[PDB]
């Protein structure tokens, strides 16, 4: 029996704060039809503005992955998009009352929980996969990001901060043994005091607190109850990347490798990949028993 596309079983309502904006935001996730993709909606505006969550719609922001259409934007989509990729949601409307997705605890945990509390619905159509056929790589100074043919899905990442707080700055997850839910989803975004102070002075990071970010001064985590994983920092880079990969609009059959990469170079990789049609093909699986990836019950 075929790997079928999925949407939401029921609507999800949540409430939170833009990390950057400091704005209270109301968030609704709704079932969408077959071949809809993930579509973000700014419902505060008349008329309503809808931005498909696709690489064609990424803006040239420095702080997070931002979707743009005209001078309308949606900021910091990568954590939510990451939770939908984790759970294999093809189709869903994401309604927002403000410009920025709420930050929650800084991870994809809350989003995964709400989604899985609602449960998912298999739809009557083949789920489409993007299969990496060739090596696609991009560099800029010391940062590298690479796709690599792999029968399955795996993300590998390295960061290198010259900071006392680095613990493991490397990790590799194969999502056909490692559970995204258990092992990546709870990994929080992080920030250095020096950086958070500059952003504050530029009137950015207005929603940030220990409640939604690991805060790191010179030497140590300042968060009273410390870390969730020994390797949280690099595990959260894997979270951002799975989110960024999903701007492709279908789940990936292949490997990702990031070295000190962020949303900019991740976005250069998707562009180059999309552009080089020798390097990828769209595939469906009529028999899930022989697919290289498997999914949780709905
Ligand atoms: C002192 O108490 C106050 C209480 O009000 C306070 C104020 C502000 C904050 C905060 C915050 C905050 C700001 C920015 C970021 C952020 O930009 N981090 C980027 C990190 C993290 C990671 N990127 C991500 O996670 C992306 C970008 C967004 F974070 C979401 N996905 C990679 N990465 C790096 O490379 C860092 C070296 C720059 C973090 C926290 C706290 C308390
Ligand atoms: Zn992040």
- Annotate the chain with DSSP letters as a single string: ---EEEEESS-EEEEEE-TTT--EEEEEEE---TT--EEEEETTSSS-EEEESSGGGB---SSS--EEETTEEEB--HHHHHHHHHHT---EEEEESSSB---TTSSSHHHHHHHHHH-EEEEEEEPPEEEE-S-EEEEETTEEEEEE--SSEEEEEE----STT----EEEEETTTS-HHHHTTTPPPEEEHHHHHHHHHTT--TT--TTTSEEE-SSSB-STT--SSTTHHHHHHHHHHHHHHHTTSSEEEEEEEEES--HHHHHHHHHHHHH-GGGEEEE--S-TTS-S------
Q: How far is the CA of 65 from the centre of ligand 2 (A)?
A: 9
What residues does ligand 1 touch, defined as CB less than 6 Å away? 63-64, 76, 78, 189-191, 195-196, 199, 205, 208-209, 213, 215, 236, 240, 262
- Choice among 263, 266, 274, 291 that is catalytic: 263
Residues with CB under 5 A from ligand 2 (ion): 189, 240
Atom of ligand 1 nearest to the CA of 159: 35
How far apart are the C-alpha atoms of 70 and 193, rounded to whole Å?
34
Method underlying the structure: X-ray
What is the token pair recorded at 15? 């409430």
CA distances from 12 to 15, 31, 49, 102, 293 (A): 10, 9, 20, 14, 27
State in Å: Cα 61 to ligand 2 middle.
Answer: 14
Atom of ligand 1 nearest to the CA of 103: 30
Reply yes or no on whether 263 is catalytic: yes
Q: Does the annotation flag 240 for ligand binding?
A: yes
């Amino acid at each position: 029996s075929m790997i079928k596309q999925r949407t939401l079983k029921n609507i999800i309502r949540a409430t939170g704060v833009g990390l950057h904006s400091g704005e209270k935001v109301y968030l609704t996730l709704k079932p969408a039809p077959v071949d809809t993709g993930i579509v973000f909606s700014r419902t505060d505006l008349d008329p309503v503005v809808e931005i498909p969550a696709r690489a064609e719609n990424v803006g040239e922001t420095t702080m997070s992955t931002t979707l743009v259409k005209g001078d309308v934007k949606v900021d910091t989509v990568e954590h939510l998009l990451s939770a939908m990729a984790g759970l294999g949601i093809d189709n869903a409307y994401v309604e927002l009352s403000a410009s920025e997705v709420p930050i929650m605890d800084g991870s994809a945990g809350p989003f995964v929980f709400l989604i899985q509390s609602a449960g998912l619905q298999e739809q009557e159509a083949a789920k489409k996969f993007i299969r990496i056929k060739r090596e696609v790589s991009v560099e800029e100074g010391d940062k590298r990001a690479v796709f690599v043919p792999f029968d399955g899905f795996k993300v590998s990442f390295e960061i290198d901060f010259d900071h006392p707080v680095f613990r493991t700055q490397q990790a590799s997850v194969d999502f056909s043994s490692t559970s995204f839910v258990k092992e990546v989803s709870r990994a929080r975004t992080f920030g250095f005091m020096r950086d958070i102070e500059y952003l504050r002075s530029q009137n950015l990071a207005l929603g940030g607190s220990v409640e939604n970010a690991i805060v790191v001064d010179e030497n140590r985590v300042l968060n009273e109850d410390g870390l969730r994983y020994e390797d949280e920092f690099v595990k959260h880079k894997i979270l951002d990347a799975i989110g960024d990969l999903y701007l492709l609009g279908n789940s990936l059959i292949g490997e990702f490798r990031g070295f000190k990469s962020g949303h900019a170079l991740n976005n250069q990789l998707l562009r180059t990949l999309i552009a080089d049609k020798d390097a990828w093909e769209v595939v469906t699986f009529e028999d899930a028993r022989t697919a290289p990836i498997s999914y949780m019950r709905p």
